[PDB]
Amino acid sequence: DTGAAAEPRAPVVTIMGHVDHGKTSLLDYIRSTKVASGEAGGITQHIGAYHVETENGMITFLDTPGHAAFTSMRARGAQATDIVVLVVAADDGVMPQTIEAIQHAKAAQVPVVVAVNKIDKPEADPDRVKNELSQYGILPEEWGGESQFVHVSAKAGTGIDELLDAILLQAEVLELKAVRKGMASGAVIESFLDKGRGPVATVLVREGTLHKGDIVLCGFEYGRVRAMRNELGQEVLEAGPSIPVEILGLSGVPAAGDEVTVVRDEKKAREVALYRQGKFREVKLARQQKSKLENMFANMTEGEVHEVNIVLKADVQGSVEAISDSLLKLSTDEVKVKIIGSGVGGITETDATLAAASNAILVGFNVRADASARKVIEAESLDLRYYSVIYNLIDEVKAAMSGMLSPELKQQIIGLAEVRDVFKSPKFGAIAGCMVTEGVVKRHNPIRVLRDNVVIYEGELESLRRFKDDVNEVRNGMECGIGVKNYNDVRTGDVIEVFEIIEIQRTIA
Amino acid sequence: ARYLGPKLKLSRREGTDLFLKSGVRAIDTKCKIEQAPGQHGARKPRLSDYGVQLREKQKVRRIYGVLERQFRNYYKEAARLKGNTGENLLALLEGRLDNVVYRMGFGATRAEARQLVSHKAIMVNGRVVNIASYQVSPNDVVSIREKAKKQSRVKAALELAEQREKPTWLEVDAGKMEGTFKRKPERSDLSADINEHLIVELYSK
Amino acid sequence: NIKSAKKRAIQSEKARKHNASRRSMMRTFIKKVYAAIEAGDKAAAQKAFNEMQPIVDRQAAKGLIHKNKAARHKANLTAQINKLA
Amino acid sequence: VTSYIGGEGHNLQEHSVILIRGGRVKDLPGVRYHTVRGALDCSGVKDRKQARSKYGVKRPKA
RNA sequence: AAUUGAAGAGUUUGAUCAUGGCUCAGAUUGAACGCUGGCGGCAGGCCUAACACAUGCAAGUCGAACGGUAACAGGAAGAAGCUUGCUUCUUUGCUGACGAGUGGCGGACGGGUGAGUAAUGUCUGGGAAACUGCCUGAUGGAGGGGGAUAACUACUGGAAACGGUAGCUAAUACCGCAUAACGUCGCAAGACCAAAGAGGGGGACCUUCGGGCCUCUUGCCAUCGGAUGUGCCCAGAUGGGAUUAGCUAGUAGGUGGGGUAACGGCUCACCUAGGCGACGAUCCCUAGCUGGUCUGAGAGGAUGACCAGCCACACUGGAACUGAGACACGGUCCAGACUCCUACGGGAGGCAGCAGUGGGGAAUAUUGCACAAUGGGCGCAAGCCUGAUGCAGCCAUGCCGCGUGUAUGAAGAAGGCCUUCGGGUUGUAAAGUACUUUCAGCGGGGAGGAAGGGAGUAAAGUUAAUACCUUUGCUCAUUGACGUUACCCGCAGAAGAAGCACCGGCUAACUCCGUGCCAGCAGCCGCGGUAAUACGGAGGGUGCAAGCGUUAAUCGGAAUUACUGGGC
Ligand SMILES: Nc1nc2c(ncn2[C@@H]2O[C@H](COP(=O)(O)OP(=O)(O)NP(=O)(O)O)[C@@H](O)[C@H]2O)c(=O)[nH]1
Ligand SMILES: [Mg+2]
Ligand SMILES: [Mg+2]
Ligand SMILES: [Mg+2]
Ligand SMILES: [Mg+2]
Ligand SMILES: [Mg+2]
Ligand SMILES: [Mg+2]
Ligand SMILES: [Mg+2]
Ligand SMILES: [Mg+2]
Ligand SMILES: [Mg+2]
Ligand SMILES: [Mg+2]
Ligand SMILES: [Mg+2]
Ligand SMILES: [Mg+2]
Ligand SMILES: [Mg+2]
Ligand SMILES: [Mg+2]
Ligand SMILES: [Mg+2]
Ligand SMILES: [Mg+2]
Ligand SMILES: [Mg+2]
Ligand SMILES: [Mg+2]
Ligand SMILES: [Mg+2]
Ligand SMILES: [Mg+2]
Ligand SMILES: [Mg+2]
Ligand SMILES: [Mg+2]
Ligand SMILES: [Mg+2]
Ligand SMILES: [Mg+2]
Ligand SMILES: [Mg+2]
Ligand SMILES: [Mg+2]
């Protein structure tokens, strides 16, 4: 990074909102692709960057879905981009997910331009959007707050001409700083694991430069680049600070995002990469000692000790950190759920072994079973379930938890009976003659023996016998007989209370 | 491949002068010979029968400044040669280049002899030699090159070199600043206080 | 993979159809020899022997039957035709 | 199998797979192995100075 | 001159001597982990999942085999925009060459792997009943004809792969005739079998004026040999278990027929009732074997990484064709498992090649450069191809060498530690003073790995020829991937470079403090319950050194499977 060379670049733009403002539609129409609703779920659960060539100059587009679950993706996408776009619908207005995107725009000090998504529907009006978002300091219009609004059809494909112009201008009015040659650096969009290609990452390069021989260092991972891939293009020789290019040949799957810096030699970068691992490992053992010692007692003070374990491996690195945060949101005091051994991709022997030791569900956002993986899963009793969307996953884990509960909320008496004129039996030691005043007496239902309102003894009936009949059930106001083991003293005037036991069941929330 | 620590601590531990303190002044005067090798070295000198074999191994190695792996190769080479193994052990150590530099009196100490040979000042039969472990054979002339000639380091050593034994097996010369190795040294010409039967025993087990 | 010996593959296919036809006609002359030997015809045995003699030795010179196999046919069939005769 | 944990104190429990070198020392009934401290996810001995090779203790900067 | 060399200790008991096991000192490894880490040379580097695979590359090459213009490099002709000297754009295989196709040779070599195989194997020593391209020695033919066909056109079935119908065209493709022993088949007389031309140049009788012919180079055909390789057979040796003792119908042998290049139950019909086996058959478990490596005084034991020989295997199972050689790693056909493509009819793929990824596992690497060199494949040669090989990158994995200063220096400093507070120790260590510049860093110079090949000449050898070609001199241009090569010289300045285990005995090397059967050490006997040289820290010390230590594996010690060499 020497020479202080300043060259203009294509602005990187991210788009945020409440789900359903047709945020994806804006991109696909510009891209003339329409990959929307071609994928499972009908919505975009993943992040990707796509550069297009349109007058004037060059521009690239980045998009992140807006959901309660993706706390991290929208936070990282804002700070990386020079310009942020916020989609808003006149029918939808403002929503708590959209205001969440407002904070990401201001805290990242990134200038913002917006577009009205629906001009097609007659019940949709712009004035509603402007005024209601007026209250918030963001999105002023012609009040001297320099922000500009755009009205697009998004289905109609109507300009757009204005939105595009604003974006170009907004990037034009601010000085665009970059360099064509120098020390390469940037951030990682999304990383995942491939079977043939190996571990890969999608990287935005702040200073644009690359070469097959150049050594690159991402986080605590290091390595030489074997090959370069850009979007549909299978191979690219050179990559500029503007257009993003998937990086390949790194040692292992890096963090979901971080600062990447190339180096001259790999040997010099080996010690640095190992140094970052030591710190990350030291804090890992540090946070491990605290959480265990935090209770300051050998066990839990109450009965919440019952827990459920899960095993998760997702193909993409961006999800495992992001959805886990949303997976810890559904956690409750009663039933505690924890993730064990989050994977970078697929499935493996040591992963199936991990679920073998402790009973757990093995789930993946997207995964396929390995040849060696099937043998283990099919042999021992386990469960392999893969889910296209995170919503179907977040629901069933809760379901697993709700079932775990075992609550019986009813201890209603089945019958109440008073005993009189005790008889002697060899087997039980006593038979207390009874007369049921209320309800029906049953065999295996538990009883409460009490005298003078206090309980002298407790137990469960072993034998209910009237005469030589030995019937299993006795109604009220019918002469009845009773005996039980481990009850020594039968006195008249006391009353025995029999009660059935039932379980209400439980739900999670 | 070298010690670098205190040379007199090696001499004090053995209880015999290793001639690493040769330099300008010699025959100690200031010594404290044995008596406190360490902090609790004033403890009684009674030592095991195994330890005295290991002690003599260090006595021979610390003079010439040879490491155990490098020394094992000389013992392995001394075993395969004809005649006595103990006599050939010290002969191969005496056949080192830096030791021949010390005997003729170019270097003041044995450590300084390796130091001077390391900088490629010494040439044998015309050709330069960096490595101090170079094997010197009969009829091999040795001399200092034109660069770094007649300096105060080498000149001071050759003056006081006449005061020592002056070995018979090589010619001192020191007029034109050269030397000649005539033949392999005899058993009487070396050893005496250091023993060959003690050092050799330890590698048998 | 489109690689090297796909030219030679169709040549060996052509050579198979060529050699299989020439080996088939070669044997049919030998097949008429034992027809006379199994029957009681001494004249047709020697007549069929003189028919196979030119064609069978010609295949040995070409280098398909491989020399001594062609020689072994005449060696065995000489002893059979003069057994009854 | 079962294995002794050397060093003073540990964070070892439940999950986080650790290295096991082996070797037999006799104290508990039937213990033929030893765990490696300071490897994979197993924490080293804190504030130890002598014998850094054993127990996976790094050299302090001085 | 050449397998010339042999260590024990600790531990049963109150103590001793035997017997006896366990443990340790030794060396070594295709190593790993922990801590630490400067450079160079050489060697080694998926031991587990014979688990599965993305992309590129790993075998092509000849116009001097023959039809040919599909590209573009000239020449030639013609038509044009015009500049009177040139470009532009359609024809033309005349040519330097060459896409695709036909044909020849090599895809059976090189490379990788240790799943099978306890004997169609390997090792060692023999035998006769066989083949063997390319390469050689010996003696002769290379005469004269015919019929196709790919490519390319005219259509047409197809998404793709890949065809179909009907014409056209050559050959070192293919098929007849003639020619025929020294060959094959026979007791003999006899019967019967082959081919190909192409290229360089040229006087003479010369051509239907393609060239005959003379001559040189190369290739084809037949036979007897040489060499090499391959097949087959016999003997011996090459794991464990008797808690496997009986096992065999083509099983053992003969005769006859067929079969293999060749002997043979190799395979059939018939006949006989044998074969193997306590000297371990059969069955089961495990495993490539050997030259050797490791250990050992030797005898042995363990082991089969790299290097090299042989065998087997090439996604699984089975089969055959082409060919001198395969029952074929990157060939074909079929079935099975599984990946990709598709308009859903139907095709395409096999990293136990080099890199590399998924994954296994404690763990082992770069999707590199170059045919410069060695050695193959093709070719007359140039030259092309060559993940073989030569090199680089990576990892202290191993071996070896060097450096991280040297010399002087008492104030035996300061500080730390101990102290019976006299001091001792750290300690010539540091500071200071006097010197040197290796290996790194920077700037210069510069071997060897390179001989050939190519273009002109001279003489000699072939020859009708001072053509041509080959061989041998001479001269002139050159051909280095590695390579900021090795190495040498100069510059600056001790500058950039020492950690690790252990200190109760065994076993080289001791005190204080903290903790008090708590926390912990341990290879073995054992230490700690308030003087711990055994724990933890500090000081000091010892061993070793870019390594160190722990664990795992093998042998030694272990005369503790004892043949050498032990007892009852
Ligand atoms: N009427 C109308 N509907 C529109 C318009 N633009 C988009 N839509 C609707 O929006 C839907 C597509 O939404 P989409 O872009 O996938 O939403 P999203 O960007 O994935 N949401 P998130 O970012 O939270 O994941 C379509 O079904 C379409 O009906 C428009 O201009 N008019
Ligand atoms: Mg809505
Ligand atoms: Mg390290
Ligand atoms: Mg060394
Ligand atoms: Mg026969
Ligand atoms: Mg190629
Ligand atoms: Mg061609
Ligand atoms: Mg014709
Ligand atoms: Mg022919
Ligand atoms: Mg004959
Ligand atoms: Mg004929
Ligand atoms: Mg002809
Ligand atoms: Mg027979
Ligand atoms: Mg095996
Ligand atoms: Mg022995
Ligand atoms: Mg097969
Ligand atoms: Mg054949
Ligand atoms: Mg793994
Ligand atoms: Mg002091
Ligand atoms: Mg240097
Ligand atoms: Mg040269
Ligand atoms: Mg030469
Ligand atoms: Mg001791
Ligand atoms: Mg210790
Ligand atoms: Mg104490
Ligand atoms: Mg023994
Ligand atoms: Mg005995």
Side-chain angles (χ1 to χ4, degrees):
Chain A
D1 61 356
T2 59
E7 296 301 321
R9 61 176 182 183
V12 178
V13 175
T14 187
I15 295 172
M16 299 175 185
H18 203 272
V19 64
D20 202 15
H21 292 87
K23 186 200 306 186
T24 296
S25 297
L26 272 169
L27 277 67
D28 290 345
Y29 179 79
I30 295 170
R31 293 174 60 189
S32 65
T33 57
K34 186 179 179 180
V35 67
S37 66
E39 329 166 355
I43 61 171
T44 55
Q45 293 177 335
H46 61 285
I47 186 167
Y50 299 93
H51 60 78
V52 297
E53 296 84 357
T54 57
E55 62 184 343
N56 297 130
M58 299 297 180
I59 186 169
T60 187
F61 294 97
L62 178 63
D63 57 351
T64 189
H67 277 84
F70 300 63
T71 183
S72 304
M73 282 192 181
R74 293 180 296 103
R76 296 181 183 174
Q79 63 181 20
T81 58
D82 291 343
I83 294 98
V84 60
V85 174
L86 298 174
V87 293
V88 61
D91 291 344
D92 290 343
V94 63
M95 291 179 180
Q97 184 62 58
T98 58
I99 188 64
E100 183 67 14
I102 300 300
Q103 184 63 59
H104 293 83
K106 293 181 69 66
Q109 64 181 19
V110 173
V112 61
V113 62
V114 297
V116 176
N117 290 283
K118 306 293 180 64
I119 63 101
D120 181 67
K121 294 177 179 178
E123 72 281 5
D125 57 351
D127 182 67
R128 197 73 145 78
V129 176
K130 184 186 293 179
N131 190 31
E132 187 176 4
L133 294 174
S134 184
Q135 185 174 355
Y136 295 92
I138 194 169
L139 274 67
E141 183 66 15
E142 295 177 350
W143 293 356
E146 74 183 343
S147 179
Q148 185 174 355
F149 297 165
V150 177
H151 299 83
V152 297
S153 178
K155 198 183 65 58
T158 73
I160 231 186
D161 166 18
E162 291 294 359
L163 180 169
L164 218 54
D165 175 13
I167 293 190
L168 209 61
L169 170 164
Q170 182 64 259
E172 185 278 336
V173 62
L174 60 83
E175 183 177 2
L176 296 174
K177 294 177 179 177
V179 63
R180 298 296 181 191
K181 60 180 293 180
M183 185 67 73
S185 178
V188 176
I189 297 170
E190 180 276 334
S191 297
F192 61 91
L193 178 63
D194 187 4
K195 185 169 170 296
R197 292 178 182 78
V200 295
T202 58
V203 176
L204 292 174
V205 296
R206 293 182 183 174
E207 295 85 357
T209 184
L210 295 174
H211 285 306
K212 184 178 179 180
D214 289 345
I215 304 301
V216 63
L217 186 146
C218 182
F220 55 89
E221 293 300 321
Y222 64 91
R224 183 174 296 106
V225 54
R226 291 193 297 274
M228 294 180 285
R229 185 182 295 276
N230 190 341
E231 63 185 342
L232 62 80
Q234 67 284 359
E235 293 178 351
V236 293
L237 295 175
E238 293 177 350
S242 64
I243 56 101
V245 171
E246 182 178 2
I247 194 68
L248 188 147
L250 181 62
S251 296
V253 175
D258 57 352
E259 296 84 358
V260 61
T261 58
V262 299
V263 295
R264 295 181 182 175
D265 291 344
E266 61 184 343
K267 182 173 178 290
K268 296 180 182 298
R270 292 178 65 85
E271 183 67 14
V272 176
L274 296 175
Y275 176 78
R276 293 182 181 175
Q277 293 179 336
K279 292 181 68 66
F280 179 80
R281 212 185 67 90
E282 183 178 2
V283 64
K284 182 180 293 296
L285 62 80
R287 293 181 295 103
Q288 185 174 355
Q289 293 177 336
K290 299 299 183 181
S291 64
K292 179 59 165 60
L293 179 64
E294 186 278 336
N295 63 346
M296 297 296 180
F297 187 80
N299 192 31
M300 296 301 293
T301 59
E302 293 178 350
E304 298 87 359
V305 296
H306 58 77
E307 64 183 343
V308 61
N309 297 131
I310 61 172
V311 176
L312 176 64
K313 292 182 71 68
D315 60 352
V316 297
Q317 183 63 57
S319 64
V320 295
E321 184 67 15
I323 65 101
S324 64
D325 180 67
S326 64
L327 189 145
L328 295 175
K329 293 181 181 298
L330 57 81
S331 296
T332 188
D333 290 344
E334 183 67 14
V335 176
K336 180 179 76 179
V337 62
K338 61 181 293 180
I339 184 169
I340 295 99
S342 64
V344 297
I347 294 169
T348 81
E349 183 68 14
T350 188
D351 182 68
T353 301
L354 178 62
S358 296
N359 290 336
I361 183 169
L362 193 149
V363 65
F365 181 90
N366 289 337
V367 63
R368 289 185 287 263
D370 290 345
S372 64
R374 292 180 178 85
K375 183 180 172 63
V376 176
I377 296 171
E378 185 277 336
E380 293 178 350
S381 295
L382 293 174
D383 53 352
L384 175 62
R385 294 181 182 175
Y386 62 91
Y387 300 136
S388 296
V389 297
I390 190 64
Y391 280 123
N392 288 338
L393 174 59
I394 188 169
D395 290 344
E396 183 65 13
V397 301
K398 288 178 185 177
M401 294 178 43
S402 287
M404 184 65 73
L405 317 197
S406 306
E408 63 183 6
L409 216 158
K410 307 306 175 176
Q411 274 213 12
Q412 57 192 0
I413 58 186
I414 191 66
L416 184 176
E418 183 178 2
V419 296
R420 58 202 65 178
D421 188 5
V422 62
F423 297 98
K424 183 180 293 296
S425 178
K427 183 178 179 180
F428 295 95
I431 303 301
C434 42
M435 294 300 293
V436 177
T437 186
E438 184 67 14
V440 176
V441 175
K442 298 300 287 185
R443 182 60 59 86
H444 298 306
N445 293 132
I447 71 177
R448 181 177 181 170
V449 177
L450 60 83
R451 181 177 65 83
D452 290 344
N453 193 30
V454 296
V455 59
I456 303 301
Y457 176 77
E458 295 193 35
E460 54 195 7
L461 285 177
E462 183 65 13
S463 64
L464 177 64
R465 178 182 293 177
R466 70 168 313 180
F467 290 75
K468 306 173 184 179
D469 291 344
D470 189 4
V471 64
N472 290 283
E473 61 185 343
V474 175
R475 293 178 179 83
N476 60 344
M478 184 174 63
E479 183 178 2
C480 99
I482 288 172
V484 293
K485 57 176 172 57
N486 290 336
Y487 184 77
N488 190 30
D489 187 5
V490 177
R491 295 181 181 175
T492 59
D494 59 8
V495 296
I496 295 172
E497 294 178 350
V498 60
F499 57 89
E500 189 173 6
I501 61 171
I502 318 175
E503 36 200 339
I504 187 54
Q505 299 189 156
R506 285 186 173 183
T507 292
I508 191 66
Chain B
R2 292 186 66 257
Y3 187 69
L4 279 63
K7 70 197 184 290
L8 273 71
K9 290 183 67 50
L10 302 179
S11 301
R12 192 182 285 179
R13 180 55 60 175
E14 299 301 324
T16 307
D17 189 27
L18 309 171
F19 311 134
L20 304 173
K21 205 198 184 177
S22 293
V24 181
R25 69 167 64 191
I27 318 98
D28 295 310
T29 317
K30 300 185 290 301
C31 51
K32 302 188 171 72
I33 193 66
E34 209 61 38
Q35 300 185 340
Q39 196 178 347
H40 301 79
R43 192 62 55 188
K44 195 185 283 181
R46 290 183 179 283
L47 198 141
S48 58
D49 200 73
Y50 178 76
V52 296
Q53 307 311 115
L54 190 137
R55 189 62 58 195
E56 191 59 33
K57 182 179 66 58
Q58 300 288 108
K59 195 188 288 182
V60 176
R61 286 169 59 265
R62 292 162 168 185
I63 292 160
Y64 306 133
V66 187
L67 297 174
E68 191 58 42
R69 188 65 61 76
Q70 183 162 24
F71 193 88
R72 186 64 60 76
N73 291 282
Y74 303 136
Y75 180 72
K76 194 183 285 183
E77 190 63 37
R80 67 177 289 283
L81 291 163
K82 298 173 183 168
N84 198 348
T85 309
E87 297 186 338
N88 295 329
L89 181 61
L90 297 174
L92 293 170
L93 296 165
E94 190 56 41
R96 295 172 65 85
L97 183 59
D98 67 325
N99 199 359
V100 172
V101 170
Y102 178 77
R103 296 288 182 187
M104 293 164 175
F106 307 134
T109 57
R110 296 172 185 282
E112 185 171 327
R114 188 181 291 92
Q115 196 67 16
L116 196 141
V117 172
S118 186
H119 300 100
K120 299 161 64 180
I122 305 303
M123 297 182 170
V124 298
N125 304 300
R127 299 188 291 283
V128 73
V129 180
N130 200 319
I131 300 104
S133 181
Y134 175 85
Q135 185 61 44
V136 182
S137 57
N139 310 296
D140 292 18
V141 301
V142 59
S143 57
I144 297 98
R145 71 189 175 174
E146 296 296 318
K147 297 178 289 300
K149 190 177 278 292
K150 65 178 282 186
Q151 303 294 121
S152 302
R153 185 182 65 184
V154 71
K155 191 187 287 181
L158 289 166
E159 186 266 304
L160 65 94
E162 192 264 303
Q163 296 181 336
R164 302 181 296 179
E165 188 168 32
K166 298 175 74 63
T168 310
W169 70 84
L170 54 78
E171 298 294 314
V172 70
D173 183 71
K176 301 182 284 296
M177 197 170 288
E178 61 175 18
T180 308
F181 184 83
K182 189 174 72 174
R183 62 196 185 77
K184 294 185 180 295
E186 301 297 317
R187 178 56 179 76
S188 58
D189 299 327
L190 60 79
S191 175
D193 68 324
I194 67 177
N195 294 295
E196 299 93 324
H197 63 86
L198 300 177
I199 189 165
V200 171
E201 282 170 39
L202 186 53
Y203 306 132
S204 301
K205 67 182 281 178
Chain C
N1 200 346
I2 300 161
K3 177 53 167 70
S4 71
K6 296 189 175 187
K7 187 173 173 184
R8 296 288 293 178
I10 65 164
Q11 284 179 15
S12 60
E13 185 60 35
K14 188 176 168 63
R16 190 179 67 76
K17 292 179 74 61
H18 177 63
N19 290 134
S21 62
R22 298 289 167 193
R23 288 178 296 183
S24 176
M25 66 182 288
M26 176 190 75
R27 290 175 184 173
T28 49
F29 295 108
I30 298 158
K31 297 293 177 57
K32 302 297 180 189
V33 179
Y34 80 86
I37 298 159
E38 291 289 318
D41 299 333
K42 298 178 183 178
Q46 186 61 233
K47 189 171 176 293
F49 186 76
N50 297 133
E51 195 172 24
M52 67 165 286
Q53 193 174 342
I55 197 68
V56 171
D57 293 321
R58 192 178 295 163
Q59 299 291 75
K62 185 61 173 178
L64 60 96
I65 203 65
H66 306 293
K67 296 176 295 310
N68 299 338
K69 179 160 169 56
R72 196 179 61 257
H73 291 308
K74 293 181 293 306
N76 296 137
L77 297 169
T78 295
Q80 302 299 289
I81 66 101
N82 76 341
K83 181 60 173 177
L84 186 58
Chain D
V1 295
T2 183
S3 192
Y4 181 81
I5 299 162
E8 297 187 337
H10 62 72
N11 71 326
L12 300 184
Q13 50 173 28
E14 294 180 0
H15 300 288
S16 314
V17 170
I18 66 174
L19 190 73
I20 174 163
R21 66 185 169 76
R24 194 172 62 76
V25 176
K26 51 188 285 182
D27 191 55
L28 281 57
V31 286
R32 300 185 290 274
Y33 304 127
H34 292 80
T35 64
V36 183
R37 306 292 303 283
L40 282 59
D41 304 319
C42 183
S43 64
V45 179
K46 198 188 286 183
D47 309 319
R48 194 189 185 84
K49 305 293 188 180
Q50 301 184 326
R52 286 167 291 190
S53 174
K54 293 178 176 180
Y55 312 115
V57 182
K58 297 185 175 65
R59 188 177 173 78
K61 297 184 175 68

